[PDB]
Design a protein around this ligand. Structure first.
Ligand code: CA
Ligand code: CA
Ligand code: CA
Ligand code: CL
Length: 216
């Protein structure tokens, strides 16, 4: 008959930060079917995108071969082959099956605001809950990580930040209650604030928020 892959098909999760030559899997085989017990050669025949993986041809150990990135290629479908090496290379008896490599998400990305500087305006005397008018799209930071490491919370900083509240989940900025804004109070009538976006690993990004206080 044939040699046999014993532990394939197999699913394994490794860190997207697994360094080059770190262990991924040990592929096991037997040639007890045909009863020959001939010497076995392993190889990866398909799915090996940019040769990100390396299989030791005598031991069947699969190692990381290039830097990995869940954000670039999150999953590999590797076809592993085992063959005997008889005098004629067409007597060659073979078996083929799948080693599926999932990359577990590492927190290697930080929240990036959609703008370096947001341009905003608030009318003086505006009541509590009045949102900023933000003229370059909504306040938004995006974190490229998968799910848990991509949840963003927002804070607002600088002198006269206390006139406003930020929803620490949506990034929406509103006038704080008990505060009414007098344009004549401010020299100049123009605030330079800092927006801060943080993931649960405390990796953050920042953006300027420039606010014109308008007349009425
Ligand atoms: Ca990555
Ligand atoms: Ca990641
Ligand atoms: Ca992150
Ligand atoms: Cl391929």
């Amino acid at each position: 008959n044939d040699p046999v892959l014993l532990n394939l098909p197999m699913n394994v999760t490794i860190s997207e930060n697994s360094p080059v030559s770190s262990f991924v899997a040990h592929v096991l085989a037997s040639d007890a079917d045909s009863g020959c017990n001939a010497l076995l050669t392993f190889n990866i025949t398909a799915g090996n995108r940019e040769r990100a993986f390396f299989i030791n041809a005598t031991t069947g150990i699969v190692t990381v071969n290039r830097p990995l990135d869940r954000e670039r290629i999150p999953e590999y479908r590797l076809t592993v082959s085992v063959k005997d090496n008889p005098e004629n290379p067409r007597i060659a008896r073979k078996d083929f099956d799948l080693l599926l490599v999932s990359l577990a998400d590492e927190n290697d990305n930080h929240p990036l605001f959609t703008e370096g500087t947001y341009q905003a305006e608030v009318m003086e005397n505006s009541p509590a809950g009045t949102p900023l008018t933000v003229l370059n799209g909504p306040i938004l930071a995006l974190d490229a990580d998968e799910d848990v490491y991509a949840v963003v919370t927002y804070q607002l900083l600088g002198t006269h930040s206390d006139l406003f509240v930020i929803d620490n989940s949506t990034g929406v900025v509103t006038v704080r209650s008990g505060i009414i804004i007098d344009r004549e109070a401010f020299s100049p009538p123009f605030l330079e604030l800092l927006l801060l976006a943080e993931d649960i690993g405390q990796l953050n990004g920042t953006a300027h928020l420039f606010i014109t206080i308008l007349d009425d």
